[PDB]
UniProtKB/Swiss-Prot annotation, chains A, B:
Domain of life: Eukaryota
Designated name of the protein: ATPase family AAA domain-containing protein 2
Entry comment describing in which tissues the protein is expressed: Highly expressed in estrogen receptor positive breast tumors and in osteosarcoma tumors.
Localization of this protein: Nucleus
Sequence similarity: Belongs to the AAA ATPase family.
Job of this protein: May be a transcriptional coactivator of the nuclear receptor ESR1 required to induce the expression of a subset of estradiol target genes, such as CCND1, MYC and E2F1. May play a role in the recruitment or occupancy of CREBBP at some ESR1 target gene promoters. May be required for histone hyperacetylation. Involved in the estrogen-induced cell proliferation and cell cycle progression of breast cancer cells.
Length: 130, 130
């Protein structure tokens, strides 16, 4: 219905705003675009579902997220990929893991403050009816 | 259930085999890998959901296709993207469009010959129950 289309449009507006705020944070530059294969040649083989903030924006615009829960799955994927690909004790690995956890924590904290629980419940109920 | 897992595993085996047969055809080399942005800088902006045969293989392996119908949507996407991005009368554009239609036609013809309709119906009924 028209009311449901308006609901998903509001969701997309909300998710774009959250994603933009993550993307302009200097700490998260490494997660903003797909990896350069020249910098990490084995990334494609080790990480089976790459994800980054530009890809998240494309998915929002393709109407791939019908709930904030589904969006957070991709944010969690950005984090889990980083922990998987950079598990070593070396400072470079530790920096990226810290930034990955910070990205995750920041996204969840924004959502906790700014997402109305009843709005999310509505989205979930519309999704389950499709 | 175990029987349903076996069904989706058989689907994945079937889809990998079809995709491999498309990927080794010389006509379809242009569709085997993501586009090189150096060759087509405006591709990212014009085509909103890029798709290629290596991406299709990754999606099979990530369990993204529960039916042949969903797989054919991505094959159709490879074709529609090509028709959209190369619409001109020039020979280069006409060649790619012809190959795109041939890819689509070939995938459908393989499926028509080799996919049991009752196998596809089972997949669809399992998908709809989830
Ligand atoms: C423009 O700079 C880059 C572009 N693309 C990828 C990276 C990058 C480089 N190194 C990583 N990890 C190494 C750190 C030192 N120990 C070996 C691994 C990276 N790890 C990542 O998770 C991502 C997303 C990029 C990246 C950088
Ligand atoms: C290694 O060669 C390539 C790598 N990546 C992309 C292409 C490519 C080049 N040109 C295209 N179309 C032009 C043909 C002449 N008129 C202007 C457009 C391409 N079109 C496509 O649809 C794809 C997938 C690649 C491609 C080639």
């Amino acid at each position: 219905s028209m009311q449901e289309e308006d609901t998903f449009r509001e969701l997309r507006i909300f998710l774009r705003n959250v994603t933009h705020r993550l993307a302009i944070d200097k700490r998260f530059r490494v997660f903003t675009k797909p990896v350069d294969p020249d910098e990490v040649p084995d990334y494609v083989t080790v990480i089976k579902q790459p994800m980054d903030l530009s890809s998240v924006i494309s998915k929002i615009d393709l109407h791939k997220y019908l709930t904030v829960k589904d969006y957070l799955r991709d944010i969690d994927l950005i984090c889990s990929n980083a922990l998987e690909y950079n598990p070593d004790r070396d400072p470079g690995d530790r920096l990226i893991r810290h930034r990955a956890c910070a990205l995750r924590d920041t996204a969840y904290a924004i959502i906790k403050e700014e997402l109305d629980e009843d709005f999310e419940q509505l989205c979930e109920e519309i999704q389950e009816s499709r």
